[PDB]
Enzyme design. Sequence first.
Site, mmCIF file in Angstrom:
data_model
loop_
_atom_site.group_PDB
_atom_site.id
_atom_site.type_symbol
_atom_site.label_atom_id
_atom_site.label_comp_id
_atom_site.label_asym_id
_atom_site.label_seq_id
_atom_site.Cartn_x
_atom_site.Cartn_y
_atom_site.Cartn_z
ATOM 1 N N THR A 1 26.252 -7.734 -1.993
ATOM 2 C CA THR A 1 27.408 -7.832 -1.053
ATOM 3 C C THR A 1 28.430 -6.748 -1.375
ATOM 4 O OG1 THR A 1 27.127 -10.236 -0.781
ATOM 5 C CG2 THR A 1 29.265 -9.305 -0.142
ATOM 6 N N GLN A 2 28.771 -5.958 -0.361
ATOM 7 C CA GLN A 2 29.657 -4.813 -0.512
ATOM 8 C C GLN A 2 30.781 -4.850 0.514
ATOM 9 O OE1 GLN A 2 28.270 -0.780 -0.795
ATOM 10 N NE2 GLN A 2 26.300 -1.346 -1.731
ATOM 11 N N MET B 1 20.196 -8.219 -0.569
ATOM 12 C CA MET B 1 21.602 -8.557 -0.311
ATOM 13 C C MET B 1 22.583 -7.576 -0.962
ATOM 14 S SD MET B 1 21.665 -11.022 1.823
ATOM 15 C CE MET B 1 23.319 -11.709 1.723
#
Lengths: 222, 196, 222, 212, 233, 125, 204, 195, 195
Positions: free
Chosen positions: E1-2, E107
């Site tokens: 997740t970014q 992800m």
Amino acid sequence: QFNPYGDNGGTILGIAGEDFAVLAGDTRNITDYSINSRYEPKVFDCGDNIVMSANGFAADGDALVKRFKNSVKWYHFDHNDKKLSINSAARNIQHLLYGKRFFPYYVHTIIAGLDEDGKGAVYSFDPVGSYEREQCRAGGAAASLIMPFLDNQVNFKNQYEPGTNGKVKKPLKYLSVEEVIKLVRDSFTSATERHIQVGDGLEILIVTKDGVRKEFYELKRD
Amino acid sequence: TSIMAVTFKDGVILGADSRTTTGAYIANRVTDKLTRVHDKIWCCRSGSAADTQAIADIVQYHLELYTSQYGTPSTETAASVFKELCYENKDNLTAGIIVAGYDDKNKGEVYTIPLGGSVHKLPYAIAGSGSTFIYGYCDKNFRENMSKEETVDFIKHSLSQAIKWDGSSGGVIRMVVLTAAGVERLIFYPDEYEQL
Amino acid sequence: TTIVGVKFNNGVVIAADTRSTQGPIVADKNCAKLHRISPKIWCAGAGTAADTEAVTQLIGSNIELHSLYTSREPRVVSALQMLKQHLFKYQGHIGAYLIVAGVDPTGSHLFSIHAHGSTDVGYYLSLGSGSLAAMAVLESHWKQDLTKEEAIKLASDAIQAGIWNDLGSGSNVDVCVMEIGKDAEYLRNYLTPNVREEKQKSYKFPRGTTAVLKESIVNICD
Amino acid sequence: TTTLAFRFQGGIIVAVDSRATAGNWVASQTVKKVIEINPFLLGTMAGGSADCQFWETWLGSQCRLHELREKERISVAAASKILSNLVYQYKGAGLSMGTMICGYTRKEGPTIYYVDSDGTRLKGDIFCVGSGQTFAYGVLDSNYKWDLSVEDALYLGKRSILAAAHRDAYSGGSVNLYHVTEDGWIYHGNHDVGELFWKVKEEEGSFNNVIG
Amino acid sequence: TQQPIVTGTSVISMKYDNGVIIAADNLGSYGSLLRFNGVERLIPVGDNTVVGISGDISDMQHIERLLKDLVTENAYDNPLADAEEALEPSYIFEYLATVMYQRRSKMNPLWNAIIVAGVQSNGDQFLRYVNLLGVTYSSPTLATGFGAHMANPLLRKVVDRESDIPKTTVQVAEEAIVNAMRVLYYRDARSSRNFSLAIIDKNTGLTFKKNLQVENMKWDFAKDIKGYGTQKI
Amino acid sequence: GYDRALSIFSPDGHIFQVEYALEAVKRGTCAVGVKGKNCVVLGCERRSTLKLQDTRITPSKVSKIDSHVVLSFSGLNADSRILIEKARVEAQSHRLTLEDPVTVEYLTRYVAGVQQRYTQSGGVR
Amino acid sequence: SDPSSINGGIVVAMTGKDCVAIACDLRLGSQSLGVSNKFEKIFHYGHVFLGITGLATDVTTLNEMFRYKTNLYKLKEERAIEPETFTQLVSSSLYERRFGPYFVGPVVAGINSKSGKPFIAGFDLIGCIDEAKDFIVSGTASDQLFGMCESLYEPNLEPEDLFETISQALLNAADRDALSGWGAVVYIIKKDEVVKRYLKMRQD
Amino acid sequence: MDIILGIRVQDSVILASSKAVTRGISVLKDSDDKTRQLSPHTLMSFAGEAGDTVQFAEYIQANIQLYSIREDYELSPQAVSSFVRQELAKSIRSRRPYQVNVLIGGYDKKKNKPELYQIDYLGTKVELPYGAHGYSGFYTFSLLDHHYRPDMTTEEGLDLLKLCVQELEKRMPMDFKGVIVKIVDKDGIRQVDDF
Amino acid sequence: MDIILGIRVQDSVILASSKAVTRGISVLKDSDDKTRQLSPHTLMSFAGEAGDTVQFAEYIQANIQLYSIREDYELSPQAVSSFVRQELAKSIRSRRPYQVNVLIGGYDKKKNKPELYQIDYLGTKVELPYGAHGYSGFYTFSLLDHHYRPDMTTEEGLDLLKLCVQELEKRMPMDFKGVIVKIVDKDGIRQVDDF
Ligand SMILES: *[C@@](C)(CO)[C@](*)(O)[C@H](CC(C)C)NC(=O)[C@H](Cc1ccccc1)NC(=O)[C@H](CC(C)C)NC(=O)[C@H](CCc1ccccc1)NC(=O)CN1CCOCC1
Ligand SMILES: *[C@@](C)(CO)[C@](*)(O)[C@H](CC(C)C)NC(=O)[C@H](Cc1ccccc1)NC(=O)[C@H](CC(C)C)NC(=O)[C@H](CCc1ccccc1)NC(=O)CN1CCOCC1
Ligand SMILES: *[C@@](C)(CO)[C@](*)(O)[C@H](CC(C)C)NC(=O)[C@H](Cc1ccccc1)NC(=O)[C@H](CC(C)C)NC(=O)[C@H](CCc1ccccc1)NC(=O)CN1CCOCC1
Ligand SMILES: [Cl-]
Ligand SMILES: [Mg+2]
Ligand SMILES: [Mg+2]
Ligand SMILES: [Mg+2]
Ligand SMILES: [Mg+2]
């Protein structure tokens, strides 16, 4: 937060005849309210007289088709070039899909071809691998528009013999390839009228004992 | 937005860019953010386009009714009416307004009114998202009692930098000159100000 | 929706597509988005369909009463002022995005209004989901000193850009031309580039196909 | 779904509907909800279609491996416990299954086991499983006796699914009947609710709530 | 997740009779701050492919390094590295597409939208898109970000379908691309005036143009616009 | 981990470690099993070079694997405990999953399988 | 807890040669539980017919409200309300509750007694008018009805042929929706006679 | 699951456990035996999360039976209870804990005394003259505080237990379909068939 | 509150309503009458939110009794049901809505016909041969679909009703402490004391 899924729209349709089977799909690819491509095919010849389409999230759809095409290749290597039957393909695809039960492929999958008695066959899958053989199935964005029309025109549902007091049903019979293509074309023009994600072009793949033929037709581009 | 108002020897000059945005889309590239509330009392608008327009319209109405009864209002009076609206409706407004006017007694005056609805009388004022990038520049370069041509250059160079760094600012640089001579509108296009 | 407005020599022209959506479903294939506020003041509306219709009718009603009261032909700025103050009062909850245009004793005018109550002035404007496609065309081909026929061409081309490229827009192009000294001409279905092709088959059923349980004559008379 | 199975004098009756839904969208009217594990074992399916279909076919593979290894058909108890122990390993992961393992063996006799996805395993004479289980119970319980004939038992199972198919919005399509005896399971046909409802209404005189 | 930090905006492109054209501006935005102005977002691979990248710039620089390394690896034990076994546009794309989809599946995506433009060994034009989700598609015209909403409509007026490609020259095609870049400067709040453009032709090869500027802009009409409705001065 | 292949084929086709394990069995005290019409009897020898033994607590030669199956042995006493323990655990595991005690054939097949595994596993005799 | 899909139901309307048809299902449920198979969703005020889908309490309330308003209309105007006028009345009344709306999908159908022209119209829950030459659809199986009507429909159908088309559109659409069905009613409407037919359909 | 009770008297331990198995709005079964024999003189009743209960009970049963075969000896009720407690005490800090509450009734043959242990899913053990799990305790504890005596017979204990079931059948919201009663004493474990 | 049933037969309407009043883990009462006589030939049963139920029932009762005195006339069951529906239809868009579901059983003396109306808290009215509110319907509707005939007698209706209560007592999770049964016919309203 990052969302790993997306919706690429489009719709697909499979019908089975006596000695043939068709698998149709529109060529439009979208995200939100934008068109990405007017011609991006999503119905593929996978070998062994099996055609396949995995509609929904295109990235997952391409991944699945890619993996199944590869599964066919290794089936030949491991079992002396044996032809992969449509029923065996269907079961194999269930395991591909269910393998990602806890992070699913976001697609409606349909495959078409001929069974081992030479008769037309259509199989349809949910995102996590449940499957069923049918004469008829529509999938994707406009599935809810097309499917009830198919029930009425392919399986003659709610149609009774005139004058029989609604006692005798209209008898089931196989449709010719000409009649089936008429229904496919009408199904997609109707879907194009009323669904925004459907349009641009229609690509049909027909499967007989002689091989896999293609037909293309223009659809409204608005 | 990038907006500013600067007092000088002969009066005051207001300056503004012409960009209006919805997210990163430019809804209007030729906006007029310098608006008349009275003959020689104008304001610079920043924040919500709807809120600032609604406020300016009400203030213009109030000052027109003031003029009918008591004659020309002071710039301070105009700033007070802006404040009253911004302060009492602080919970429902997103408006950063700079009020600028020319009296003959008081000469050029600038009042700034931030989000809270407080009033601040200053020699010059800057506001809007793009103002952040020119606090350093404006403080170093501003002098009191500048000439018309010097003040025009000060505003032009300032907003040029604000526009250059702020994505929410751009288009043309509009200016309005308020002096005893009258009201003068100025415009400056990208081809000129970008290469300053 | 895609809607546009373009100023020319002796007046102003507005245009709009004719698609009405309900999620991904096309509810109305030929709806009228051009609204008459007064004889020579017209409105193009995007956003919530009921809101654009209701707000345009209310202000149109009050404009008529104002015109009768003052013994004067109504002005565009009056409609603009009444619309924006109404919309502002409702803090954006009335989802009406309007392009207001017309001719009056003061001259020709072109404005846009947004749901929260902000107004803009311009020679060319576009609103709706297809406004970016339309504005791209307007920014490419617009010039100062357009003729009547050039402005109609530019306006309809800007709508077409929305029709073809935006999924929210489609079907036909409506136009309204408001020239100074002349009656406003409303050109309903000025272009119809999305006619449905002939169907492959007639789905006329044999009489008696549907099974019936009861018949009865209904009394509509007193 | 609506599925049932009950034990009686002449063995076991198993009856299921054939509908599959995705929300309010009726996805299929022709789903096979009974899985034929061997000539003496049946499995019913309710809940997630993929979960049921996948793991009950897998169960059949495990039962085949038992009789290869042990030279003897697996017991109904052992077969049901393979499935229940499997889903218990996945407890909390989100599997959705309401199943019934029905069959006959020499040591056990006719036996029914309820197995669900939160790990519950219950031996019993009567079970109804699915969204329309309550509707099936209402008819089944009020007409059930141990001394029912094979003919009457088949009808009651059929009639109970019909009851649920009618009232439950997420049940319908057709009725699939099975009878399990000491000699194995016997299929007793696919019965479309389209024709079956009116046939039952006319002949039985029931369903007076409906416009005839 | 970014979450993306330093970002690049639109990349636009189209096919023409003998090849493909691709363009992208030279800006590295930091939110609303127009932070970096010397950023090259078109990266050539060999003499037959150009990869245009939008989105996160740190991830763009990572992808640069991968392509750079791909050229090195292809040269290893390859006597025909500058001939029959040179890197094709289709090879470069499929590699990136594989990486993008693998990263989304873990992800932890590369927060980018990518267009691979080039010419194959048999002369065929290559133009295909891929993004952070691993989604891929091809079209006569392709664009990312705001380009998808504003450039595509303009470029599709030139090449609307396949049959329009032979009828479109490099002069007409470049004109449309340059025009689209101007429109984006008018309307995209995270765009710059300075941009790069690249042409890959089957005859004349790779032409890489740097330090181009948007010009012939219409701003004069702004002087006539006063107030927001009723104002006259 | 210790990996050495200790049980391996010789030129004549014999696995000497397995055959030498049989010699250990030949050294062990005699054990006999006789089954009648309605019973089985297990008889076991105990060597008498050990006087001053405590027979209350000394490990018995016949071990219960479950309430219905018994196991006697000949050979290394310490080795037998490992097999008996594994057998007892499998007996309870079978009751748990199959809901039925082991057959004598099944229990034997398991114990025999354990013994076989130790003839072609690395690092074990 | 989505008001428009608690009870379920559908309505469809079509035009033909000098005639109109309007049809509806009979189901009323509470989510999965079917409760009533006699719940008609089509009402009429003089020669103007109104179908209403959605939350059943609002269906009942609006029927009672439009009966109320059309009765007062007739007393003051000394004539029956026409379809075009009634359509405007429905739109006004729904928009009056803009920020507390009735959760409904109404459909108007009828023949103008002066001009003889067939007329149909549809609305969203807050009053937006949707006029059509061909057909209008509404309810929980609206997607299905859109697909059926768009393919099956042709212009200028005779009353007897139009009956078959609209009936097949409703029946097959209802069978693909869990919350719709349990019986059906079709109204064929000519200039000065109206026939009402109950359809035989599957009861699951 | 729901109602499990236990009463220790002079010479025996009596366990009562409800017969109902409910899921949703349906009573799926009305003859469920919520207990497992761990050894000839030790009985464990259980209640809690579906699946977990039986899985845990049978796991404990297997371990105690394994011990019995290995040592040719029966563990004391105290020893069994401590083993069970530790297993639950481990479980509560696992990735997915066993949500099971148990009563352990046993007769110690070395002491010639009945013993009742109450253990919750956290691993909280107490020895008690009478015990209950869940909402049952809110009625039965006060009742037993009044009527219980330490020197009662097995018959007196059953009458005392009838008094508890009657109170629960009067004031409990749910229909638990009666109870299965079992007695643990010097002669082992037996079931009362008419209750 | 919980279980309310209604059956219309040839010559009468029969209402059955559960007797239990539960709050928390305690059954506070097992003889509660969940009904009010609105008029001599009209009876209303009710179920729902605590407090709301009785408050609403008595409010309706007062209004119907007021009407009866004013006009010296009894409103028809149809008229009463429409009045009740409208009150609930108003209520649902109030600041705090009545969370009450009702059945209205009446005998129309002008038509000489029994009538049963089912109305939920939203104001959703339907006339039915048999009706239920809450989870009861999930068992009783399918049962009545099978066994109900339109020409049944009052005695046949009571046997049909016994069949429903037996099914509910078998498969429902909660103990609802039986039902109070009342009959509405040409002679008015009377209570069955032995059910
Ligand atoms: C610079 C840009 C920032 O200081 C200037 O201050 C200018 C001032 C000029 C125009 C007077 N400000 C804007 O351009 C202003 C920026 C802004 C946005 C949101 C809140 C406050 C300020 N833009 C607007 O006001 C636009 C004008 C429209 C496009 C004509 N309005 C919006 O963007 C509306 C505002 C809604 C709103 C939010 C909070 C308080 C008041 C109003 N927003 C939207 O339409 C939302 N939009 C929907 C589609 O998805 C993208 C977001
Ligand atoms: C282009 C097509 C898209 O922007 C245009 O802007 C047009 C404008 C023209 C028609 C004036 N917009 C629409 O067509 C518009 C799109 C839309 C949808 C939802 C919210 C805002 C805009 N469509 C509508 O407004 C339709 C009109 C119908 C087809 C007659 N209305 C709806 O879709 C309503 C929305 C009502 C609403 C309520 C509260 C706040 C905002 C909007 N939605 C439904 O009918 C959905 N649902 C059906 C089942 O019953 C419950 C409601
Ligand atoms: C009765 C009929 C209803 O409960 C039965 O219980 C049947 C059992 C039979 C079919 C074995 N159950 C269903 O029909 C079951 C209900 C259900 C749905 C979702 C989760 C649990 C239970 N339906 C399904 O399993 C359908 C069957 C398809 C339509 C053939 N499948 C889905 O809804 C799938 C997969 C759901 C899913 C589960 C776990 C992880 C991921 C997904 N979902 C979709 O296809 C999504 N959607 C359908 C509409 O089109 C857009 C995509
Ligand atoms: Cl503004
Ligand atoms: Mg379309
Ligand atoms: Mg800028
Ligand atoms: Mg049903
Ligand atoms: Mg249905």
